[PDB]
Amino acid sequence: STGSATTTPIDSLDDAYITPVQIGTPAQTLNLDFDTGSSDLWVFSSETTASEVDGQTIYTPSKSTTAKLLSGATWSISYGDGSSSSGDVYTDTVSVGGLTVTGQAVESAKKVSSSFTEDSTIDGLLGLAFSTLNTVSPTQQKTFFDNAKASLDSPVFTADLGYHAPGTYNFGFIDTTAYTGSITYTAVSTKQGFWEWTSTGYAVGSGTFKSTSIDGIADTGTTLLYLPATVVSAYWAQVSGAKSSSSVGGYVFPCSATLPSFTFGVGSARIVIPGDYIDFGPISTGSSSCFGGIQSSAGIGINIFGDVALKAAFVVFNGATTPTLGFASK
């Protein structure tokens, strides 16, 4: 079997992408953030403390004929965001884009963090990292991909994120009209339970490709591209007017600027971020200063190939028993 589903940015900035997911019987549709940096599919629900739900469509499990309590099981989660969330845990039918999985753990929020309450556009998150990072206890629960796998035509999903525009998550097949040229595959480590890979170098605009290993994660959950301090400093170097801002928290540059592209290596291949991708948008409203979309990972502690790097590309998450990461230009 396969699935396709469209995924639409939640603002004009491309801060985050939501994709509708069908839960229960009859279907409730929720718009979840697919997030490949975490392994929990949680949803705002009829259990969520009222004072903590502002606009989001909740999952009610009592209205699902298919639902069942997973008694014992609780779950608790914090994000790099310092975002957080806890609840208890049902199993229910979940469909994405017409790929159905039964007995998916669906973790139903009793509480949420203020960041999430405030975020009226995201109903919940769908986690797409390795199951070793699932937070349900006492026994971990398999992601929707892991559940799906046994029925997919191929055990893959692909992320075609859009630049200020919709795009598509595909489960079970690779859509060869979606990208240009060939896919390059690189090796994944699940030691930390992430889509963690090593990029091979990088070049800023027209300049030399420097060959220098950048281990990072592929995380459709993060907005910007987080790279080591010297690489970010190198790139921002070719933009006068740009500087670091402890006020606003990273590199900012005049909106009118014309950013150089950014090339990251994937094996012997190369993927080009347009400059225009790397212009996140003016730092507050009407400002002539924009925030940059390349930023220093050094406070985080891990390089993150967020949404700004992924949306330049067609990315294939290959989850055979020796999982790999495919990247093609589009």
């Binding site: 997030d35 993060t222 907005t223 910007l224 925030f291």
Partner: peptide, 7 residues
């Protein structure tokens, strides 16, 4: 802006 950082 309004970055997001999903673990």
């Amino acid at each position: 802006x309004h970055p997001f950082h999903x673990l």
